[PDB]
């Protein structure tokens, strides 16, 4: 028994197109270095036959391989080449403002997952210009495991083409898929007492009080668009299935950014956006709630006493 070099190599683009439109790879790698081209074949002396992909055995990853074993044979020192074409599928995360995504497998790409070929101004591209491609209505073999498999036509597909691999993802619409705010909770009957420099939204049910600067946020901030409609429908949902109709809507729905960085939708009854993050422990608001309550109550008594 002697050595065992094993190197991991990106297919050529014509082959990428074959792979994902036929669920099969060619049994030969060829790369030119310096002058001549070099070439490897699967089992020795083989031809350039096609080879279909089949499933591996498993993590979050999903692999498809064209050969499930390793091989060799017995006068002088001989060196067999085992050729394996392998398509693997990893989840990649990427967080705002999406100037790069990364896989659990150590790939890091400095392109926006939403760099629709057109919108580099409203997005980011920052990998090798040489190697990046995009193909509108692009066919895909929809399941590499089975070879009969139907065909999907993906809207927009990118290919990055790195040294150890070629990376592909389906280009989506930002704003359509990403929303930067999430419904925390709703407080029916909240009390907006005004103060020196701040409103105090005291909620008994969620045992806490929130303070906002006195200038509410423009409702037409683009930031709010992804929950804008939900928030009103969340509001109207209450004033409909909460109290009777002796109460009635005072003033329009107004939105406030609170210190700490929540965002509050307000709708009264009767008878321009900090890039900040949300604060994690909400005691600071239960604290404000405590003070607000005792102080409110103390003044009430001591007044009616005096």
């Amino acid at each position, epitope marked *: 028994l002697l050595g065992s070099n094993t190197e991991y190599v990106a297919p050529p683009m014509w082959e990428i197109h074959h792979i994902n439109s036929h669920s099969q790879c060619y049994s030969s790698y060829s790369r030119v270095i310096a002058g001549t081209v070099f070439v490897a074949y699967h089992r020795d002396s083989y031809e350039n036959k096609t080879m279909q992909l089949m499933p591996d055995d498993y993590t979050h990853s999903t692999r498809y391989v064209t050969v499930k074993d390793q091989w060799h044979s017995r006068n002088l020192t001989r060196e067999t080449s085992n050729l394996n074409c392998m398509v693997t599928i990893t989840t990649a995360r990427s967080k705002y403002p999406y100037h790069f995504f990364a896989t659990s497998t150590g790939d890091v790409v400095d392109i926006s997952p939403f760099y629709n*070929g*057109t*919108n*580099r*101004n409203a997005s980011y*591209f*920052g*990998e*090798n*210009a*040489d190697k*990046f*491609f*995009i193909f509108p209505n692009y066919t895909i073999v929809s399941d590499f495991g089975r070879p009969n498999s139907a065909l999907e036509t993906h809207r927009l597909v990118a290919f990055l083409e790195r040294a150890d691999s070629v990376i592909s993802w389906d280009i989506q619409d930002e704003k359509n898929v990403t929303c930067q705010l999430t419904f925390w909770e709703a407080s029916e009957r909240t009390i907006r007492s005004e103060a020196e420099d701040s409103y105090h939204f005291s909620s008994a049910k969620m045992t806490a009080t929130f303070l906002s600067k006195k200038q509410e946020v423009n409702m037409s901030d683009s930031a709010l668009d992804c929950v804008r409609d939900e928030a009103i429908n969340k509001l109207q949902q209450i004033f409909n299935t909460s109290y009777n109709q002796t109460y009635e809507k005072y003033g329009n729905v107004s939105v406030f950014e609170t210190t700490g960085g929540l965002v509050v939708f307000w709708q009264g009854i009767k008878q321009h956006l900090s890039n900040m993050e949300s604060v994690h422990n909400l005691v600071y608001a239960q604290l404000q709630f405590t003070y607000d309550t005792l102080r409110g109550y103390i003044n009430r008594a001591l007044a009616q006493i005096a």
Partner: antibody
Amino acid sequence: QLQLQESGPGLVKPSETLSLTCTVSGASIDRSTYYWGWIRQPPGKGLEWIANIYYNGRAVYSPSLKSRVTISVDTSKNQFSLKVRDTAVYYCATRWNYFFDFDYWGRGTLVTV
Amino acid sequence: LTQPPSASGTPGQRVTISCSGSSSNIETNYVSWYQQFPGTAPKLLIYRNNQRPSGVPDRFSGSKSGTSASLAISGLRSEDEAEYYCGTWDDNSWVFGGGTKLTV
């Protein structure tokens, strides 16, 4: 956002060399470059394509200029220039987008021979 | 490349423009059109044939076959008065056509 301005001489005696340098407030060229070329237009005439260069030394000229043109690039100060050895308004437009073609334009001042 | 230096239409007419080159250019590549208001720099109007950048309405159109292209500005109005230029990649570089003044 992308940004392209232009400086350079505005009075050239015949047969003498002209130098035009286009500054970008991208502000970088990268291996993520695509193309950056020159485009000239005689006032009252149509548009004419001049030269074109990548972050590598290689470049593409129009033989209409019989390669009288010769462009240069300094990534250091984030600029690319041009050398010529016929009077018009000039421009520097680029490629900043897969698909498309020529997008993002920079006003390039007027020069007269 | 080739373009007729003018064109005409009353407000609401489907005006068209041809774009003539050889088989070296428009045959095996992609056409781009540009709405240059006089005194400014050209805005891409149509990219890689028929496709419209964000902003350009459905009124403008694309069309290509053989070694000549087209640009159909239906629903023609006033502000559409500008200088439209077509152009693609020949086998070695970038070229423009003559140009056309739209007058309504």
